[PDB]
Every structure is written in C-alpha cells, then in structure tokens.
C-alpha cells in the first residue's frame, strides 16, 4: 500500500497473508473454512496466515493453516486478468474471535464514490520497493466505470473496478495482490492489477466481487 497508514493491530480481522515461504499475497476470510483471493495469486502450495499484524514476528494471535483446496475461477484469463478470483479452502476451520473474523460478501455492487478500505503487506513505494512488517491501510473511493476505462483503455472488462485516486499518490501495490477492498462492511474488490503504483491517472484495478457472489456460494456449497 502506497500512501496509506499502519493499520491498528488486528483492525482488519478478515485480512490474511498467503505464505509460500514468505508473504506473497493477501486474501479475505469469508467463512471459517474459506478465503477469497486473486487467481493470479495461485500457487500449488500455500499456507494461510490469519490474525497477523507484524508478519515478521510471532505476536500470539496468529493462526497458520494450510490451504487444502485452491480453486481459481474457471474463466480466469491470465492475459487480461478477467475473472481474477480464487477460493481457498482451509485444511482446518479457523477459530473465529475478535482478531480473526469473516467479512460479508456484497449484497449489491458499490456505487461510484463509495468510500472503501484497502489493506495489505505490499510495497509502500511508488518508485523502488519497501515491504513492511506491519499491515497497511488505505481509504479510497470506488471510481466510475468511465473513469476506469479512460485510465485503462481497452482493458477494463465488466468484471473490474477502479478504486483510488486519479491524482495518484495513494494506491495498492505489488504484494497487496489478492487482498481486500471493503466498503460498508462488504468485500467489493480484490487487489488485481494496475500500471505501476500510485501513478497519476492509473488507479489500481480490482476484481468486481459483486459479480461473483453466486459462483462463490455455489463453489463453497459443492466443496
Ligand atoms: Ca508470525
């Protein structure tokens, strides 16, 4: 996250870190057994880390649970990142408490200008790289489809939203991949892609979670 703030400890209790030796992606807990992330975060072996704040230090509230099922959207397009969504079934249910909690799926799509919270352990610099120990937070609004398409001509499908600032300076970035955009208590976006980070007129692009509620529910129901 570039231009954000350090989140207060466990203030994003649905935020998880996907680990394959080190942190490589975020994700969001949506029930005690299921995490949603980005399909471009796919790896064949993943440990889900819940209750994290400082990802480099054992603080006592962590739950480390292996990914058992790893299911990318069947229509995920690796070239365009259309349908960039992935579900992970934990090998054991997470123990839900105040520091490890689910976030609701959307009951409807978020309107442009809706304020949201983006979070993750990704790069905090728009030039170069700095990867934080502490979870980072950013308040950012949903942008209109026309503004998102003007930012990225010929690449914004109906399954993508832009969230952020056309003036740049504040954005998700590499390593935030797969993490949450939550608006009014609902997971509306998944960190998907962009042109660099926090550049002028290149806000981050996020998977439009509201398009996938039925796919998510059916996948969980069937697995
Ligand atoms: Ca730890």
- Tell me which of 23, 40, 53, 73 is the catalytic residue: 40
- Tell me which of 37, 119, 151, 177 is the catalytic residue: 177
Q: Active-site residue 40, yes or no?
A: yes
| Spatial distance between the Cα atoms of 138 and 136, rounded to a whole number of angstroms | 7
Q: Active-site residue 84, yes or no?
A: yes
* CATH 2.40.10.10 domain range(s) in the chain: 13-102+211-223
- Smallest CA-to-CA distance from 210 within 171, 158, 172, 173 is with 158
C-alpha of residue 197 to centroid of ligand 1, in Å: 27
Q: Active-site residue 192, yes or no?
A: no
C-alpha of residue 62 to centroid of ligand 1, in Å: 6
DSSP per residue, 18-70? EESSSEEEEEEEEETTEEEE-GGG--SS-EEEES-SBTTS--S--EEEEEEEE
| Spatial distance between the Cα atoms of 195 and 65, rounded to a whole number of angstroms | 33
Q: Which CATH architecture has domain 13-102+211-223?
A: Beta Barrel (2.40)
| Spatial distance between the Cα atoms of 187 and 109, rounded to a whole number of angstroms | 10
| Spatial distance between the Cα atoms of 183 and 141, rounded to a whole number of angstroms | 9
Instruction: Specify the 3-state DSSP secondary structure of 72.
Output: strand
C-alpha of residue 54 to centroid of ligand 1, in Å: 7
- Tell me which of 37, 53, 82, 84 is the catalytic residue: 84
Pairing mode, if any, of strands 23-31 and 63-72? unpaired
Instruction: Specify the 3-state DSSP secondary structure of 149.
Output: helix
| Spatial distance between the Cα atoms of 192 and 81, rounded to a whole number of angstroms | 8
C-alpha of residue 35 to centroid of ligand 1, in Å: 19
Q: Which residues contact 145 (CB under 8 A, 6 or more apart)?
A: 112, 156, 161
Q: Any binding-site annotation on 62? A: yes
| Spatial distance between the Cα atoms of 223 and 205, rounded to a whole number of angstroms | 29
150: exposed, middle or buried (Cβ count in 10 Å: 0-12, 13-18, 19+):
middle
| Spatial distance between the Cα atoms of 171 and 163, rounded to a whole number of angstroms | 8
Token duo for residue 78? 């690796």
C-alpha of residue 84 to centroid of ligand 1, in Å: 28
């Amino acid at each position: 996250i570039v231009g954000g703030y350090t989140c207060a400890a466990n203030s994003i209790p649905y935020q998880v870190s996907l680990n394959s030796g080190s942190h490589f992606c975020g994700g969001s807990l949506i029930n005690s057994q299921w995490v949603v992330s980005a399909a471009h975060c796919y790896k064949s072996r993943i440990q889900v880390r819940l209750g994290e704040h400082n990802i480099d230090v054992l603080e006592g509230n962590e739950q480390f649970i292996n990914a058992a099922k790893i299911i990318t959207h069947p229509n995920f397009n690796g070239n365009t990142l259309d349908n960039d969504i992935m579900l992970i079934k934990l090998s054991s249910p997470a123990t839900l408490n105040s520091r490890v909690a689910t976030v609701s799926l959307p009951r409807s799509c978020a309107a442009a200008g809706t304020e949201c919270l983006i979070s993750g352990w990704g790069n905090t610099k728009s030039s170069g790289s700095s990867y934080p120990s502490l979870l980072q937070c950013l308040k950012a609004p949903v942008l209109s489809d026309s503004s998102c398409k003007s930012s990225y001509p010929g690449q914004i499908t109906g399954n993508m939203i832009c969230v952020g600032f056309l003036e740049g300076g504040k954005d998700s970035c590499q390593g935030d991949s797969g993490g949450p955009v939550v608006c009014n208590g609902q997971l509306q976006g998944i960190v998907s892609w962009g042109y660099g980070c926090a550049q002028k007129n290149k806000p981050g692009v996020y998977t439009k979670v509201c398009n996938y509620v039925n796919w998510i529910q059916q996948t969980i129901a069937a697995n």
